[PDB]
Amino acid sequence: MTPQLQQAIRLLQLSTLELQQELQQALESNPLLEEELPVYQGETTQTLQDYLMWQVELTPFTDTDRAIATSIVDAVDDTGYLTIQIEDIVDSIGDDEIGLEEVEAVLKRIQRFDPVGVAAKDLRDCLLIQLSQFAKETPWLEEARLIISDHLDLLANHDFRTLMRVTRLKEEVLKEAVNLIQSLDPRPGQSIQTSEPEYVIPDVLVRKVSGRWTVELNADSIPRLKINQQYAAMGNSARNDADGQFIRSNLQEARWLIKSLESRNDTLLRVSRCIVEQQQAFFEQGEEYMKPMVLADIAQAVEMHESTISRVTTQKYLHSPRGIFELKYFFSSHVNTEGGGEASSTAIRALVKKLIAAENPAKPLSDSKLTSMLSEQGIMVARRTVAKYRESLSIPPSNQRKQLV
Amino acid sequence: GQNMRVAFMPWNGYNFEDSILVSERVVQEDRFTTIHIQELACVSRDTKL
DNA sequence: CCAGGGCTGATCGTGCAAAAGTCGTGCCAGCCGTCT
C-alpha cells in the first residue's frame, strides 16, 4: 500500500474529464502512446446590438453626435437597459466640454429606435417612453401618466385603495387604468435570441432489452491506454545501460498505469451492476418506487469495502431512458414503515410533489394535514420531515401559495 | 394526369417553342390542383438551467 | 557436472480507523384567522 496504490486511488475518485486531463497530461512525460469546407456553413446572426447599430447609420446625426451614440449603445445590455449611468458616459468620454445634456439629447432619440424603450434609465423611464409613443386618444392616458410619474412606490405594494386619496383619482376607474400599465410589457431588449445551446453529462448507459436492463459503459467516453510494442523490444539491445534503466522505468510505470486504469473500469462496471440488480424497480416504475440503498449494503454485495465504493460513485453519471442521473443520487436515507419495512426518502419526496401538485389550489394544505395524510396511507412520518422535503424542492411557502379562487 | 381538350395552333404567340396556353375553365374546375403537406417539429431541449 | 543454498530484481494486495456531514425529530419562537 505504497505510492503506486496511493496514486491509483485518486485515479477513480475524480470525474472523467479530470481523469482524461491527468491521463493525457501525464502521457507526454513517458513514451506511452494513448491512441463542405473549413467553415461548417457560417452564418452571422444579427442581434439586438447590431440591430441598434443599423438604425444609427440610417439616421442623420453629425460627426460628434455619432460618437456619442456609439458609446451609448455599447452600454446597452441583453436586458435592454443602459448599464451604467447618464453622467457616467459623460465622464467616460474624457472631454469635459461635452455637456451632460448633449448625451441626453442623443439618448432622448436613441430610445425611440426599434423596440421603443430600449436603453431605458432604471426600469421606469421605460414606461414613460413607451407611453408617450402611442396616441393620446387612449382612454386613461392622463391617469396612467400621473401614476407612473411619481406613484410607483405605492403601486409596488400591489395596493390600489391608497392611490385614490393620494393622487385625487376616481372610484376604481383608475384600476382599469392600472391594467393599461400592466400591458405595457417592459424590457423590450429581451426580444433576444433564445439560442441557449444544449447540455450533457454522458458516462455509463442502461438499455432495457428483453426485460432486466443491462448496464454497460460508453464506447467513446472511456479512455483506453495501451503500451507501445515498438519501444518495448528496444530495451534489451540498449548500449550505455543508462538508456536501459530509462526504458525499464518507463515500461514499469506504464504497466502500472495501465492496470490502475483497467482496475477503475472494472470497479465502475461492477458498481453499475449492483445498483441495477437492486433498483430495477426505479428504472421501471419511477422515483415513487425507489428502494433505499446505503454504501454498506453495496459493499456487502460483492467482496467490497465502503471506502472503496465511496470514491467510485463520486461525480459519475448514468444515462437511462428515465433520464440522466448521478450515482450519488441513488443513495439515500430511509424511514420506518408499516410492517417493519423501510421507505426511501425519494419516494416520500415524489409523493409530496404529486400530492402538492394535485391538492386544491383554492385553499392550500398545511404541513400538519400532509403529515396526517401520509400517516393514514401507512408511512408513519413526522411534521419536520415533511417540512424539510417541501423546503428542499424550491418551495419555501406552504400557506402563502394562495391564488384567486 | 387528366384528359384535356388540346389543339395545335399559334394564338398571339402565347404558345411559343415550349409554352402551353391554358384556358380559364381549367382554373374554375380546379383541374390539376394539388395538395402539399409539410411538418414542423419542436423539441424541449433540456439544458443545465 | 549437478543439486543445494544465498542474493537479488520483479511482482503486488483496492483495506482501516479517525474526523466530519446528514437527517429523524423534538423544542421553541414568530405570524395570522377567529371569537371574545
From Swiss-Prot, chain B:
It comes from the Bacteria. The RNAP catalytic core consists of 2 alpha, 1 beta, 1 beta' and 1 omega subunit. When a sigma factor is associated with the core the holoenzyme is formed, which can initiate transcription. The rRNA transcription and antitermination complex (rrnTAC) consists of RNAP, NusA, NusB, NusE (rpsJ), NusG, SubB, ribosomal protein S4, DNA and precursor rRNA; S4 is more flexible than other subunits. In pull-down experiments interacts with CedA. (Microbial infection) Interacts (via flap domain) with Escherichia phage lambda antitermination protein Q; this interaction renders bacterial RNAP resistant to transcription pausing and allows it to read through termination signals. Acetylated on several lysine residues in the presence of glucose. DNA-dependent RNA polymerase (RNAP) catalyzes the transcription of DNA into RNA using the four ribonucleoside triphosphates as substrates. Resistance to the antibiotics salinamide A, salinamide B, rifampicin, streptolydigin, CBR703, myxopyronin, and lipiarmycin can result from mutations in this protein. It comes from Escherichia coli (strain K12). Co-administration of salinamide and rifampicin or salinamide and myxopyronin suppresses the emergence of resistance to both antibiotics. This is DNA-directed RNA polymerase subunit beta. The chain holds residues 797 to 845 of 1342 of the full protein. Belongs to the RNA polymerase beta chain family.
